[PDB]
Design a protein around this ligand. Sequence first.
Ligand code: WFI
Length: 280
Amino acid sequence: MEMEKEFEQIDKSGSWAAIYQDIRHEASDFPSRVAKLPKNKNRNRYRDVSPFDHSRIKLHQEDNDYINASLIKMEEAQRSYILTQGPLPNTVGHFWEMVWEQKSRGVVMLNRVMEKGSLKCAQYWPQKEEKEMIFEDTNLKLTLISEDIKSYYTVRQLELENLTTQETREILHFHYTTWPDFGVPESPASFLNFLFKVRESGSLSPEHGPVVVHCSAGIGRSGTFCLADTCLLLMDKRKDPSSVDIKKVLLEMRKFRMGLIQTADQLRFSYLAVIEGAKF
Ligand SMILES: Cc1nc(-c2ccncc2)sc1CN
């Protein structure tokens, strides 16, 4: 059923809340035993948001391999994403260790460091060229190379150095800076412009490791980003683009991380983004 028609049908009936709760009811439930170990309590931002054991990213160390991060693997679209929480003061070193170990080219950030007057994630990247960051727990150095500030987003070039081997890589930081404190954007134009700026970079392409995507919990805005990308890619690939069922793609993705798309407004926004995106 053409998504645009289903859309007008839910909008006129005002049943967004009812569709959203049907998804919550049918969503996968798998064990998260590693996330709930007592040694990992300070590695989790939110008590109710955990990675499933079957899909969690493992850090390459014998001490403690745990990070709040999941691999979403979309078989038919041929795309992979790592979804993670905003780093904590004690997990900034783990975060960059993961970026290094997984061979990621890009980091996508969908939140501000402070929102609603509270801290949503650590200041985990350097703000001045001449003031680099060293993560002594994971033996990494991070340097700001350049910064391009636009109206709706900022792109940064970063240099990550493995202090153990003296190898370096260029990491691109895509920072969407204008998502509102409450609700969702009124038009997805600027969100869609961001998704194609990331795409053009090569960060989402199979010659690199998976892109790392985060907001505060790594399920809401982060969910919206990977659902819209995968849905448009499937509309490109298939003989009948109307066959793309946004609700079925979301339930497939929820086999890999719990809670993706946090509100009925985020679900309506996801629909808006894929409808306007299609035209081009
Ligand atoms: C290649 C492609 N580029 C699109 C685009 C470009 C600029 N701004 C928004 C969207 S849609 C599309 C279909 N694969």
